[PDB]
């Protein structure tokens, strides 16, 4: 199905569809940390003294995991904490047909979480009986239990994030309110209010479609906008593979910890995999040799886990830097970058909070219902050559019109919408036609 090319026909779209495309990016990962000594030497002084001969290996590993855990707070701050003031949407939804109830918070819900973030939090689930959950039981929501709770799980510990899921949802609500009430202006300055139909009209004028297109099709565009967001909920529910990037992060971290703990069951060439038996069954001199084999194996296991987390944390940081760029350029502005903020011409985007991630709903303009018209580069009228100021010359078969590129709005060829340069003998493909002059009928009286 190739596109037929000819040197004098142009296909111009006579219609459009507004569409919404969902984008999901990870932002952070669970702030887990692992104590070197409690992992290698479980409540054991003989193992601790032998480990001291290895120098800074424990303290180096603790610094590495602590650094990763602090990067996670930075990632979340860089993405969501962009909004400086907590703006709020008006209680009345007289936006001119545009229904944002699917993305705005619900007062009826127990949490100020929108009906799309409700599906997002109910669809991203961590592993069943995973240490991330199991740690929540011995901790009992009491900070004082951390030392005892960490002792049970071989030194593994999970740290609470500096921004809770409730605070992160609050920031997206401010981002959403600012966008609907002030357009671009809350990202660059004070929040200059503007009616939403006029705001949307300037999104149209940005992609190169005149603003009168919106005001004359305002009801149809609002219906297209509402139906597109309505399809998002069904698309997310009926497809549980849409949150694969967020689950991938959670699964990779869970599989790392599970393997790290199971390494404690390996003998590593010693006489037994349990330190208590080596110390209670064997001669006191004969124990150091067996413990060294365990220490070497367990220290190498921890080093492997730490390096993997370092590489993976860098990968998530790259995704978090991208989410912050998409927040500024897709949500707080209108991007001219073609596939950055969705496919089609970018109109606007809406951030939605997700577990350790963000979801962007990119509203874009897609041309539809193309028709082919004969075209010419210029017009000969009085020996002079006339070029369109904006748009293209098209012919419906007998008459010539000038129309905008991205929508079929034909207009009479006039001195107002054309400019003159050169003469007829230079331009290749020039055509003879009349050019209307608004002053002549006034002088015709």
């Amino acid at each position, epitope marked *: 199905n190739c596109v037929a090319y000819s040197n004098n026909s142009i296909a111009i779209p006579t219609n459009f569809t507004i569409s919404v495309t969902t984008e999901i990016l990870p932002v952070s990962m669970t702030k887990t940390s692992v104590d070197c000594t409690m992992y290698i030497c479980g409540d054991s002084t003989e193992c601790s003294n032998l480990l001291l001969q290895y120098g800074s290996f424990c303290t180096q590993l603790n610094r590495a995991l602590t650094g990763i855990a602090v990067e996670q707070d930075k990632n979340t701050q860089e993405v969501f904490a962009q909004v400086k003031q907590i703006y709020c949407t008006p209680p009345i939804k007289d936006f001119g047909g545009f229904n944002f109830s699917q993305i705005l918070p619900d007062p009826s819900k127990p949490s100020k979480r929108s009906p799309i973030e409700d599906l997002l939090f109910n669809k991203v689930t961590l592993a069943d009986a995973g240490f991330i959950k199991q740690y929540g039981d011995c901790l009992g929501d009491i900070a004082a239990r951390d030392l005892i709770c960490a002792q049970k799980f071989n030194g593994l510990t999970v740290l609470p994030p500096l921004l809770t899921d409730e605070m992160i949802a609050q920031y997206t609500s401010a981002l959403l309110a600012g966008t609907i009430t002030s357009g671009w202006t809350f990202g660059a300055g004070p929040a200059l209010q503007i009616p939403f139909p006029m705001q949307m009209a300037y999104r149209f004028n940005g992609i190169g479609v005149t603003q009168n297109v919106l005001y004359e099709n305002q009801k149809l565009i609002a219906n297209q906008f509402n139906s597109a967001i309505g399809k998002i909920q069904d698309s997310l529910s009926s497809t549980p593979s849409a949150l694969g990037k967020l689950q991938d992060v959670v699964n990779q971290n869970a599989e790392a910890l599970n393997t790290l703990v199971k390494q404690l069951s390996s003998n590593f060439g010693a*006489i037994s995999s349990v330190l208590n038996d080596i110390l209670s*069954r*064997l001669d006191p001199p004969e124990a150091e040799v067996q413990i060294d084999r365990l220490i070497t194996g367990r220290l190498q296991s921890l080093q492997t886990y730490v390096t993997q987390q370092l590489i993976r944390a860098a990968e998530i940081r790259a995704s978090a830097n991208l989410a912050a760029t998409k927040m500024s350029e897709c949500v707080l502005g209108q991007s001219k970058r073609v596939d950055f903020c969705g496919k089609g011409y970018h109109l606007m985007s809406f951030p939605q909070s997700a577990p350790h991630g963000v979801v962007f709903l990119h509203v874009t303009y897609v041309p539809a219902q193309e028709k082919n018209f004969t075209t010419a580069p210029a017009i000969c009228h009085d020996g002079k050559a006339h070029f369109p100021r904006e748009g293209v010359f098209v012919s419906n078969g007998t008459h010539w019109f000038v129309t905008q590129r991205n929508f079929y709005e034909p207009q009479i060829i006039t001195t107002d919408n054309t400019f003159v340069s050169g003469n007829c003998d230079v331009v290749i493909g020039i055509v003879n036609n009349t050019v209307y002059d608004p002053l002549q009928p006034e002088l015709d009286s």
Partner: antibody
Framework: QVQLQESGPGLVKPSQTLSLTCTVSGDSISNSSYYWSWIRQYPSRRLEWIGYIYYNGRTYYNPSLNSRLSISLDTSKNHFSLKLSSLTAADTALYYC????????????????????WGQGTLVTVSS | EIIMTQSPATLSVSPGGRATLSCRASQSVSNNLAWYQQKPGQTPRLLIHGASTRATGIPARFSGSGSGTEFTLTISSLQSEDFAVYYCHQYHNWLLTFGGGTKVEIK
């Protein structure tokens, strides 16, 4: 199966050296699966472990009599021996030689298993 | 050392009855226990090894149980020849040690 037979002087003067020999038939003392031990039994039915030697010659002794004791093996004749010095009247007991099974071994150390069988046992009297 | 205490120093059981013998360790000896039978003037015979694995050729009436610290040997049908001294023994630690022995008298 294996059979163990003790031999030694039944009457030894105090402050003399006791020498016991346990000849092993049906097995080689160099078999990697065994350790060979000495246990003495008192008239009060009390059993006391004296010491054992691995097939490769590694010896472990009871600290209660560590400074008086040595155990050795001879691969030519398949027997292991006990030498107990500084004998007192408290050393009068019934000395058994027994074959133990070695357990899991790694890195030059072994866990123990049970003793089976015991030798017939030789009675040693320490008196003038 | 792991001191091993056998609770009944002597036990009088009617023929055909049931005898229960207990052995207590000072610290966990795990499953590393054995029970030895010494008939009067004879060599000790291994009855049970591990916690409860009966040795080959031992009547099914001899049953051992326990783990960690408390262990129990039970004789299910006291024949006339089961009169002996029964020793528990631990091979958990190096420096293996024996209990005091229970003399199972028969009425």
């Amino acid at each position: 199966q294996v059979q163990l037979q003790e031999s030694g002087p039944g009457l030894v003067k105090p402050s003399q050296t006791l020498s016991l020999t346990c000849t092993v038939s049906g097995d080689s003392i160099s078999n990697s699966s065994y350790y060979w031990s000495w246990i003495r039994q008192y008239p009060s039915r009390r059993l006391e472990w004296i010491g054992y030697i691995y097939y490769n010659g590694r010896t472990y002794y009871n600290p209660s009599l560590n400074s008086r004791l040595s155990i050795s093996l001879d691969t030519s004749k398949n027997h292991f021996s006990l030498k107990l010095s500084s004998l007192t009247a408290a050393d009068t007991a019934l000395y058994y030689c027994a074959r133990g099974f070695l357990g899991y071994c790694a890195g030059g150390s072994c866990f123990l298993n049970w003793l089976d069988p015991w030798g017939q046992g030789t009675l040693v009297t320490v008196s003038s | 050392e792991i001191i091993m205490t056998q609770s009944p120093a002597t036990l009088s059981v009617s023929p055909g009855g049931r005898a229960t013998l207990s052995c207590r360790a000072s610290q966990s000896v795990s499953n590393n226990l054995a029970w030895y039978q010494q008939k009067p003037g004879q060599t000790p015979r291994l009855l049970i090894h591990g916690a409860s694995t009966r040795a080959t050729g031992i009547p099914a009436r001899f049953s051992g149980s326990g783990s960690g610290t408390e262990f129990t040997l039970t004789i299910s049908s006291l024949q006339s020849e089961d009169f002996a001294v029964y020793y528990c023994h631990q091979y958990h630690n190096w420096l293996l040690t024996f209990g005091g022995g229970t003399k199972v008298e028969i009425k």
